[PDB]
Enzyme design. Sequence first.
Site, PDB file in Angstrom:
ATOM      1  N   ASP A 102     -25.287  11.946 -49.683  1.00 56.33           N
ATOM      2  CA  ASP A 102     -25.245  10.756 -48.782  1.00 56.33           C
ATOM      3  C   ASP A 102     -25.297  11.167 -47.305  1.00 56.33           C
ATOM      4  O   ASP A 102     -24.390  10.800 -46.501  1.00 56.33           O
ATOM      5  CB  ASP A 102     -24.008   9.876 -48.989  1.00 56.33           C
ATOM      6  CG  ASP A 102     -24.072   8.991 -50.219  1.00 56.33           C
ATOM      7  OD1 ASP A 102     -25.061   9.099 -51.009  1.00 56.33           O
ATOM      8  OD2 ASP A 102     -23.127   8.189 -50.384  1.00 56.33           O
ATOM      9  N   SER A 128     -24.172  -0.773 -56.255  1.00 55.77           N
ATOM     10  CA  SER A 128     -25.222  -1.244 -55.313  1.00 55.77           C
ATOM     11  C   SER A 128     -24.625  -1.462 -53.921  1.00 55.77           C
ATOM     12  O   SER A 128     -23.759  -2.345 -53.789  1.00 55.77           O
ATOM     13  CB  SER A 128     -25.886  -2.493 -55.836  1.00 55.77           C
ATOM     14  OG  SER A 128     -25.261  -2.930 -57.031  1.00 55.77           O
ATOM     15  N   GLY A 129     -25.057  -0.655 -52.947  1.00 56.79           N
ATOM     16  CA  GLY A 129     -24.900  -0.945 -51.508  1.00 56.79           C
ATOM     17  C   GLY A 129     -25.957  -1.936 -51.042  1.00 56.79           C
ATOM     18  O   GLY A 129     -26.516  -2.654 -51.902  1.00 56.79           O
ATOM     19  N   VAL A 154     -24.415   1.095 -62.240  1.00 55.08           N
ATOM     20  CA  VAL A 154     -23.258   1.897 -61.748  1.00 55.08           C
ATOM     21  C   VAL A 154     -22.750   1.318 -60.413  1.00 55.08           C
ATOM     22  O   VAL A 154     -21.559   1.502 -60.125  1.00 55.08           O
ATOM     23  CB  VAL A 154     -23.643   3.384 -61.664  1.00 55.08           C
ATOM     24  CG1 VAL A 154     -22.817   4.162 -60.651  1.00 55.08           C
ATOM     25  CG2 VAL A 154     -23.535   4.018 -63.040  1.00 55.08           C
TER      26      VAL A 154
HETATM   27  N1  LIG Z   1     -19.532  11.632 -54.145  1.00 57.01           N
HETATM   28  C1  LIG Z   1     -19.972  10.835 -55.154  1.00 57.01           C
HETATM   29  C2  LIG Z   1     -20.622   9.607 -54.871  1.00 57.01           C
HETATM   30  C3  LIG Z   1     -21.064   8.816 -55.906  1.00 57.01           C
HETATM   31  C4  LIG Z   1     -20.892   9.187 -57.258  1.00 57.01           C
HETATM   32  S1  LIG Z   1     -21.404   8.224 -58.535  1.00 57.01           S
HETATM   33  O1  LIG Z   1     -20.413   8.342 -59.538  1.00 57.01           O
HETATM   34  O2  LIG Z   1     -21.829   6.937 -58.065  1.00 57.01           O
HETATM   35  N2  LIG Z   1     -22.732   9.151 -59.010  1.00 57.01           N
HETATM   36  C5  LIG Z   1     -23.973   9.202 -58.350  1.00 57.01           C
HETATM   37  C6  LIG Z   1     -24.363   8.393 -57.261  1.00 57.01           C
HETATM   38  C7  LIG Z   1     -25.533   8.704 -56.609  1.00 57.01           C
HETATM   39  C8  LIG Z   1     -26.284   9.781 -57.021  1.00 57.01           C
HETATM   40  C9  LIG Z   1     -25.839  10.515 -58.100  1.00 57.01           C
HETATM   41  N3  LIG Z   1     -24.703  10.251 -58.787  1.00 57.01           N
HETATM   42  C10 LIG Z   1     -20.236  10.419 -57.489  1.00 57.01           C
HETATM   43  C11 LIG Z   1     -19.779  11.236 -56.482  1.00 57.01           C
HETATM   44 MG   LIG Z   2     -21.194   7.700 -49.742  1.00 56.30          MG
END
Ligand SMILES: Nc1ccc(S(=O)(=O)Nc2ccccn2)cc1
Ligand SMILES: [Mg+2]
EC number: 2.7.11.24
Length: 348
Positions: free
Chosen positions: A164, A28-29, A26
């Site tokens: 976050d 990567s930072g 999905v």
């Molecule tokens: N605010 C926000 C940030 C990231 C995402 S995600 O679609 O990457 N889904 C994720 C990312 C990390 C943890 C859970 N879902 C959706 C909403």
């Molecule tokens: Mg963020």
Amino acid sequence: RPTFYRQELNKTIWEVPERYQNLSPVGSGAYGSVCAAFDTKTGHRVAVKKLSRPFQSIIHAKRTYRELRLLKHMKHENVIGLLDVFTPARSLEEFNDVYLVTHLMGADLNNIVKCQKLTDDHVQFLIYQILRGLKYIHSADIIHRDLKPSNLAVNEDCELKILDFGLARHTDDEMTGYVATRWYRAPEIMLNWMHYNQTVDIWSVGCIMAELLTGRTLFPGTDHIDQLKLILRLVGTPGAELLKKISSESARNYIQSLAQMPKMNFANVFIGANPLAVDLLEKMLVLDSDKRITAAQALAHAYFAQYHDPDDEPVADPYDQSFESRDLLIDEWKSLTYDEVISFVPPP
Ligand SMILES: Nc1ccc(S(=O)(=O)Nc2ccccn2)cc1
Ligand SMILES: [Mg+2]
Ligand SMILES: [Cl-]
Ligand SMILES: [Cl-]
Ligand SMILES: [Cl-]
Ligand SMILES: [Cl-]
Ligand SMILES: [Cl-]
């Protein structure tokens, strides 16, 4: 101990329990790699985050411990919680990798502010939920420090979660120039005026609420000084009482170089908004952090009369952050983290 299986997803080895299926990258930072997965035990779609280089330095080892402590503590409907944490290690001696599991979030607040029409009733419900979550986080003496639309998950039913948390990550280059990373920050932290506290998060809620009402960023500065000039034009220049609380002599000298400006009329800025929304923005966007409304006070404001339920606005269990002042070696931080992985109890 579950059975683990291995695969390579974009140049990275993933070793996870059999319960997690259909892994797909999905994003990567610099903190880790994230995959979507199906969890066969719970039936939820989940995010699985593999930390990168969790124990590479004292700074990195302590940050890993901080993140796992914070996520294990947060148990609230409007805050991200921890579904699972695991390591394929069978002992402290071979312990190297940490994996965190949360509910998979679809859309953020950016994916509804930009492309969707909002009624006043939508703004009431969204801001109510942020404040309900913040009452809980602040009751544990936790400061989020990075509230902004991309850190707020929202579903089709307008239901919201905070995620976050600021783990003290953001760099100088990340905060430079025409960047959303800085637009929601309180002026006392943006310019290092003084020891900040939990009031910085209420400034960020004011900036988010203004942008839901107008569909435009409140303070889109091209740099730190441009942004300060936008802020002071709205709320007015500081009086003697706030100037005394700024610890940097150079920061006080700089403020005193600016021409004095009065606070603007917020009804002439937020044209056509609910008068109760205007009143609550005047109480959040106060330059002196001592005088800002708190989350607990804001929940009782007449703007939220349709949603406020003082018997369904819970506080957190006490949170011990004494580790923050502790000086340890990499292997000591790594042992503390290992204990927190093995003691994890999942939610019902
Ligand atoms: N605010 C926000 C940030 C990231 C995402 S995600 O679609 O990457 N889904 C994720 C990312 C990390 C943890 C859970 N879902 C959706 C909403
Ligand atoms: Mg963020
Ligand atoms: Cl399993
Ligand atoms: Cl959650
Ligand atoms: Cl490992
Ligand atoms: Cl954002
Ligand atoms: Cl604790």
